[PDB]
Design a protein around this ligand. Structure first.
Ligand SMILES: COc1cc(C(=O)[O-])ccc1O
Ligand SMILES: COc1cc(C(=O)[O-])ccc1O
Length: 164
């Protein structure tokens, strides 16, 4: 596990998106993962794997209300670094029914960071996003659909990141 993932799981969300300055909203509402956006800053991005594998409902209490109830889910928790400096922690939960067809690849991603560049085959949409916060830090959670199949993606922005 990891202190940053512990922090990510403590974020508290608002049903309504706050009226933040537009520079900060550009970042939080971005329709993609942070990969290319961070590279844009003049950085090399790398992933540290914290935890990966199949888990049962009891391991995903925060996400369960937002996804289909199934026997198993694929869990992916990472730390994203920019030139060696941690900038983000992320937690992705995929119901196993979403793992079919091209989407089965979500399972073999490893240390490659997630991004729209990887799913050119599938159709991508987001039906919900909320902004959260904890102890001065910003986070967000989104339900994305690949070819109609859902997954939940949560991101915590570390203070080293450009949002601050
Ligand atoms: C938030 O992460 C993403 C968002 C969206 C989106 O919101 O449409 C698409 C792909 C992503 O990897
Ligand atoms: C680089 O940005 C992201 C990567 C991942 C990942 O690889 O699981 C998740 C959320 C992100 O914003």
């Amino acid at each position: 596990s990891h202190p940053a993932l512990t922090q990510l799981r403590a974020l508290r969300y608002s049903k309504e998106i706050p009226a933040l300055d537009p520079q900060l909203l550009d970042w939080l509402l971005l329709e993609d993962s942070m990969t290319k956006r961070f590279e844009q800053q003049g950085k090399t991005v790398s992933v540290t794997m914290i935890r990966e594998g199949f888990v049962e409902q009891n391991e995903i209490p925060e996400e369960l209300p937002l996804l289909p109830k199934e026997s198993r889910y694929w869990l992916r928790e990472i730390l994203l670094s920019a030139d060696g400096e941690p900038w983000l922690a992320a937690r992705t939960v995929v119901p196993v029914s979403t793992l079919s067809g091209p989407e089965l690849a979500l399972q073999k991603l490893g240390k490659t960071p997630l991004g729209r560049y990887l799913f050119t085959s599938s159709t991508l949409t987001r039906d919900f996003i909320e902004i959260g916060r904890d102890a001065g830090l910003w986070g967000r959670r989104s339900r994305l659909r690949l070819s109609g199949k859902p997954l939940l993606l949560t991101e915590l922005f570390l203070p080293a990141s450009p949002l601050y």
